C-alpha cells in the first residue's frame, strides 16, 4: 500500500545474507512473505515460512566442512541448503534446550539435547546469528 515501505523491517548484510525485525503485523507479514516468494532464491526450500534472518555459513563436521545457505524462520526453522547443487540438506531440530553459543565473531554453536551444530560465519557476524536465533528463542518460548 502506499506509505507501506515493507522495506524497512529488513536488514541486508550482503546479496545473500540479511535479518528482518520481528514486530511487524500479519498483515506486513504477508507482504514480507510475498516478497520473498518472487525474489528470494531460497524460498522454495522453507515450508512457506517467512525466512527472518539467512545467510551462508560453513558448518563444520568430520575434518572439515560443507557451506551451506542456513535459514532462520517462522516455525520456527532453521533449515540449511546446499547453496550449489540447490538442495534442502536438512534442519537443526527446534526444541526448548536450543541454545546458540558464540565463540568469537566467526565461529558459534547450536546446542540441541542430541548434536551440537559447529558453524563458521567467514563474514564475523557469528554474534548476529547467536542474537537473532536467541530472540526467536525467547518469543517462541517465554512471553
Given at each position: ?18 535479518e528482518l525485525?520481528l ?29 527472518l534472518k539467512?545467510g ?16 532462520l ?27 546458540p ?24 557476524n557469528?554474534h548476529k546469528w547467536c542474537r537473532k536465533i536467541q530472540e526467536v528463542w ?6
Amino acid at each position: 500500500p502506499l506509505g507501506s515501505n515493507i522495506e524497512q523491517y529488513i536488514h541486508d548484510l550482503d546479496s545473500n545474507s540479511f535479518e528482518l525485525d520481528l514486530q511487524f503485523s500479519e498483515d506486513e507479514k504477508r507482504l514480507l512473505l510475498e516478497k520473498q516468494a518472487g525474489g528470494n532464491p531460497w524460498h522454495q526450500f522453507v515450508e512457506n515460512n517467512l525466512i527472518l534472518k539467512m545467510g551462508p555459513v560453513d558448518k563444520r563436521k568430520g575434518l572439515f566442512a560443507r557451506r551451506r545457505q542456513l535459514l532462520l524462520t517462522e516455525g520456527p526453522h532453521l533449515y540449511y541448503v546446499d547453496p550449489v547443487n540447490k538442495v534442502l540438506k536438512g534442519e537443526i531440530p527446534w526444541s526448548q534446550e536450543l541454545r546458540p553459543e558464540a565463540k568469537n565473531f566467526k565461529t558459534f554453536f547450536v546446542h540441541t539435547p542430541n548434536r551440537t551444530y559447529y558453524l563458521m560465519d567467514p563474514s564475523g557476524n557469528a554474534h548476529k546469528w547467536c542474537r537473532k536465533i536467541q530472540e526467536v528463542w525467547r518469543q517462541r518460548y517465554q512471553s
